[PDB]
Ligand binder design. Structure first.
Ligand SMILES: Nc1ncnc2c1ncn2[C@@H]1O[C@H](CSCc2cc(C(=O)O)cc(-c3ccc(O)cc3)c2)[C@@H](O)[C@H]1O
Ligand SMILES: [Zn+2]
Ligand SMILES: [Zn+2]
Lengths: 298, 115
């Protein structure tokens, strides 16, 4: 583990190519903890390592970058992950966050309620989700693909992610969805990323890098989650907070990526290639308008 | 003429020996920053910790209205630097102290315009 000095560990490509069957996840280092810097909370450390890993990918970073963050409230009413995302993102990036429960936030704008009540007019450059329902982690029954908020997330990616944009969506052994894995094949590249501070847990972020709006690759989502569990089961990851102590190169690079508005007939292989290298965003550049549905009754 | 005075209510509860507001969001940073009080990214120096602003605002945290006509919050969406010796009560600190308008440091913990 030269891995201990990385922000985390990504699913190696050879594990993606397997055809494993789903097993129960049994982590060697389950119940260990990393020692966090004094007074630093798990969700700050976790989002910091996630952003540090995203720094190594070909993220498109336009002027007027637009980021939306789902599942951003804590049980203490604040938004630690949102605070890390604002630190990471270029000054002036529009950041909207949301959560079922009320919380106060550093985001430019916040919507409270089930994520299915959230509507936006515009498309987004980067979607981050931390949503998780702890009722799913019941070990006593079959681990099938889950719907709930994952159904919203897949719809939201297909309808509201700009071409070239990227996603990072939290999953676990039991909190996962087969269509979301299938959608990873609609990006130029994908992985499952485990932060070193939370390596004792089956959580990972499914990261889709540079959205292409069409299948580049055909992915069976039940097989790929089985492959992810197999990787985790046979590759213990040493807990580590090492990367948190060097923040000198943390901010996301201002790449000034080009934004163009194109009808879908104009997406040729040359556009696709620019999307694939993080050099192009395709969406409009109008005002960002969002809203929340309110049900009225007595 | 009635207005609820939450700033005074929190200072009074600190005075009687009450536990400060917790779970202010402390950031990872280099601790080689300018040291100014309220900034767009963490700017803590060797003697400071950096916190996400909204989590350090009394009015945000207590879900009450901000005391000015505009209604605006000048911490939300920013980062506030707290002296490490005061970081047990970031809300109390920001409420009780004042930012220098010329150099941007805290009056009394970094402002050097007065000698
Ligand atoms: N449909 C939705 N729409 C909008 N937001 C949603 C939706 N679904 C979930 N969220 C939000 O996601 C955010 C992250 S869950 C983090 C988490 C992790 C763990 C763990 O593994 O240790 C345990 C619990 C937990 C334990 C006991 C409880 O009683 C409640 C939670 C919670 C929360 O703030 C949720 O509100
Ligand atoms: Zn406030
Ligand atoms: Zn001064």
């Amino acid at each position: 583990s030269s891995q201990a000095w990385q922000p985390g560990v990504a699913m190696p490509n050879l594990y993606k190519m397997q055809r494993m069957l789903l097993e129960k996840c049994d982590l060697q280092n389950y119940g260990d903890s990393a020692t966090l810097p004094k007074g630093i909370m798990m969700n700050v450390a976790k989002y910091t390592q996630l952003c540090q890993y995203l720094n190594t990918l070909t993220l498109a970073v336009p002027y007027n970058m637009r980021v939306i963050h789902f599942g951003a409230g804590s049980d203490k009413g604040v938004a630690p992950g949102t605070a890390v995302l604002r630190q990471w993102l270029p000054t002036g990036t529009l950041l909207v966050d949301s959560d079922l429960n009320d919380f106060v936030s550093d985001a430019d704008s916040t919507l409270i309620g089930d994520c299915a009540t959230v509507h936006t007019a515009n498309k987004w450059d980067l979607i981050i989700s931390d949503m998780y329902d702890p009722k799913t982690k019941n070990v006593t029954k079959e681990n099938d693909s889950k719907e709930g908020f994952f159904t919203y997330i897949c719809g939201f990616i297909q309808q509201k992610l700009a071409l070239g944009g990227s996603v990072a969506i939290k999953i676990t052994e039991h909190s996962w969805n087969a269509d979301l894995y299938k959608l990873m094949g609609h990006f130029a590249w994908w992985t499952a990323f485990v932060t070193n501070v939370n390596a004792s847990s089956s959580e990972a972020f499914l990261i889709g890098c540079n959205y292409l709006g069409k299948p580049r690759e055909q992915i069976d989502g039940y097989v790929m989650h089985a492959n992810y569990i197999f990787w985790r089961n046979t590759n213990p990851i040493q807990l580590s907070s090492y990367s948190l102590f060097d923040m000198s190169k943390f901010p996301l690079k201002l790449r000034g990526t080009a934004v163009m508005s194109l009808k879908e007939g104009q997406i040729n292989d040359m556009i696709l290639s620019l999307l694939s290298k993080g050099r192009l965003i395709i969406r409009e550049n109008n005002r960002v308008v969002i809203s929340s549905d309110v049900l009225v009754n007595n | 003429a009635f207005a609820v005075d939450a700033a005074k209510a929190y200072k009074d509860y600190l005075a009687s020996g009450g536990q400060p507001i917790t779970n202010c969001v402390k950031m990872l940073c280099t601790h080689t920053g300018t040291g100014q009080a309220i900034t767009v990214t963490p700017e803590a120096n060797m003697d400071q910790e950096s916190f996400g602003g909204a989590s350090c605002c009394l009015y945000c945290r207590c879900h009450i209205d901000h005391p000015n006509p505009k209604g605006f919050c000048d911490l939300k969406g920013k980062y506030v630097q707290i002296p490490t010796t005061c970081a047990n009560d970031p809300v109390g600190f920001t409420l009780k102290n004042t930012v220098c308008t010329v150099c941007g440091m805290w009056k009394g913990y970094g402002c050097s315009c007065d000698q």
